[PDB]
Each structure stands twice: as C-alpha cells, then as structure tokens.
Paper text:
The SPZ’s main surface antigen, the circumsporozoite protein (CSP), plays a pivotal role in SPZ biology and constitutes the immunodominant target for host antibodies. PfCSP contains an intrinsically disordered N-terminal domain (PfCSPN), a flexible linker region composed of NANP and NVDP repeats (PfCSPrep) and is flanked by N- and C-terminal junctions (PfCSPNTJ and PfCSPCTJ, respectively) and a globular C-terminal domain (PfCSPC) adopting a so-called αTSR fold that is connected to the SPZ plasma membrane via a GPI anchor. In this paper, we describe the functional characterization of 12 camelid single-domain antibodies (sdAbs, also known as nanobodies) targeting PfCSPC. sdAbs correspond to the variable domain (VHH) of heavy-chain only Abs (HCAbs) found in camelids (llamas, alpacas, camels, and dromedaries). A structural characterization of the sdAb-PfCSPC complexes through macromolecular X-ray crystallography (MX) and/or AlphaFold-Multimer shows that most sdAbs target the non-protective α-epitope.
Diffraction quality crystals were obtained for PfCSPC–sdAb1 and PfCSPC–sdAb9 complexes, and data were collected to ∼2.1 Å. The crystal structures reveal that sdAb1 and 9 target the PfCSPCα-epitope. This epitope is composed of the Region III residues (adopting an α-helical structure), the flexible loop between the two antiparallel β-strands of the TSR fold (referred to as the CSP-flap), and the hydrophobic pocket between the α-helix and the CSP-flap. The paratopes of sdAb1 and 9 are largely similar, which is expected, as they belong to the same VHH family. Noteworthy ‘interaction hot spots’ are sdAb1 amino acids L101 and F103 that are inserted into the hydrophobic pocket delineated by PfCSP residues L320, L327, L358, Y360, and I364. Three other important interactions are the salt bridges formed at either side of the α-epitope between sdAb1 R105 and PfCSP E357 (left side, only for sdAb1–PfCSPC) and sdAb D99/D113 and PfCSP K317 (right side, both complexes), which likely stabilize the hydrophobic interaction center. For the sdAb1–PfCSPC complex, the experimentally determined crystal structure further validates results recently obtained through a combination of molecular modeling and mass spectrometry. We note that the predictions were highly accurate, displaying an almost perfect overlap with the experimentally determined crystal structures (Cα RMSDs of 0.99 and 1.08 Å for sdAb1–PfCSPC and sdAb9–PfCSPC, respectively). Indeed, fluorescence imaging of fixed PfCSP–PbSPZs shows that sdAb1 more readily interacts with MG SPZs compared to SG SPZs, independent of their maturation state.
Numbering used by the authors:
A (entry chain B): 311 to 375
B (entry chain A): 1 to 125
The structure:
C-alpha cells in the first residue's frame, strides 16, 4: 500500500483510532492495518504523530478478480 | 500533481521579521496538512511548523516556538510562515511541504508527499 493509501485510510477512520488493530483497508490485494501504539495509548487524535504514534502493518488479501 | 511555490525569502537584519508564503496550484490545497522545513547545508531538512488541513491545529519546533506562526488561507490555496525576532541561526533555505494526512503530527521530511523549491532566508547580525 502506498503512502497515499495509508494516509487516506487514516483520514477516514481518524475519529475511530484506538489501540486496537483496524481491519484491513482492503478486502482484496495488499492493504494496511493501523492502530495507536500501546506506548501512545490515550493520546488524542490531534497529538498522534504519524511516525511515532501510529503503528502500521501490511495486510495481504487474496488477489482481486 | 500539485505544484508548490514559495515566496518571500531574502536578507533581513537580526531582530527583524519576514513573511514567507507558499502557493499551491490546482484545487487540492484544502485536503493537505501543510508544513515548513528548513535546510542548513550539511544537515537533514529540519521541521519548523505544521498545520492541519482545516487550519484548526498547529505544531512548532521548539527552536522557533514563540517566534514563528504558521497559518493558511484555503480560499487562496496558500500557507504562510510569519517569522519574528529572527536570529542568525534561522538562516536557511525554507521549504513548504504538503502532507496527504489531514490531521495529527508529522515532523519527518520523509513523511511529506509534495515539496516546493525552497526560498533562501539570510539573517545578518
């Protein structure tokens, strides 16, 4: 997933960010999963640093048909 | 793909003030968080300030806190950096940068998506 894909997904769930892993951003192909890092728990939305506070991992789904 | 262009650099006496501006082409400026960075030769680009896409939240490096102000006019597709009480240590090429992330903090140059071409700012004692 591109930087644009990751950030546009964060913008969409921006008021739903929590320490819980999000679902995959896509149902097919490669997407991202995001969460607030446990060390950053309870940091309000507007204090979250993109690099330091938001954990991001790739989620691979089945190819798109 | 949005084009960013700075204006306002130049020579200024220590203790003086300067207003830099940065204009975005097209019709996407309002969807970006905007940032300013500065390049001293021999170091990485240093974060100066950031403003969310709405303009409701701003963030500063401690080296300019209390002296610089970042603001935006979404009607003009322009972001601004007002610099007061300038010091010789403020001498640098200043760059605007656009971030697709519309909220939160971001202080690393690598995590911004579009860049202007830089305007030199020189502060003599």
């Amino acid at each position: 997933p591109s930087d644009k894909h990751i950030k546009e997904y964060l913008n969409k769930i921006q008021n739903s960010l929590s320490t819980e892993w999000s679902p995959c951003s896509v149902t097919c192909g490669n997407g991202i999963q995001v969460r607030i890092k446990p060390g950053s728990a309870n940091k309000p939305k507007d204090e979250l640093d993109y690099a330091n506070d938001i954990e991001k991992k790739i989620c691979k789904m089945e190819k798109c048909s | 793909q949005v084009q960013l262009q700075e204006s306002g650099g130049g020579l200024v006496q220590a203790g003086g003030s300067l207003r830099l501006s940065c204009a975005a082409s097209g019709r996407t400026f309002s969807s970006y968080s905007m940032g300013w960075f500065r390049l001293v030769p021999g170091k990485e680009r240093e974060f100066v300030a950031r403003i969310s896409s709405s303009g409701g939240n701003t963030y500063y490096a401690d080296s300019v806190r209390g002296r610089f102000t970042i603001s935006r006019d979404n009607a003009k597709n322009t972001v601004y950096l007002q610099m007061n009480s300038l010091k010789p240590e403020d001498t640098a090429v200043y760059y605007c940068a656009a971030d697709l992330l519309q909220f939160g903090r971001s202080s690393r140059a690598a995590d911004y998506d579009y860049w202007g071409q830089g305007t030199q700012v020189t502060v003599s004692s």
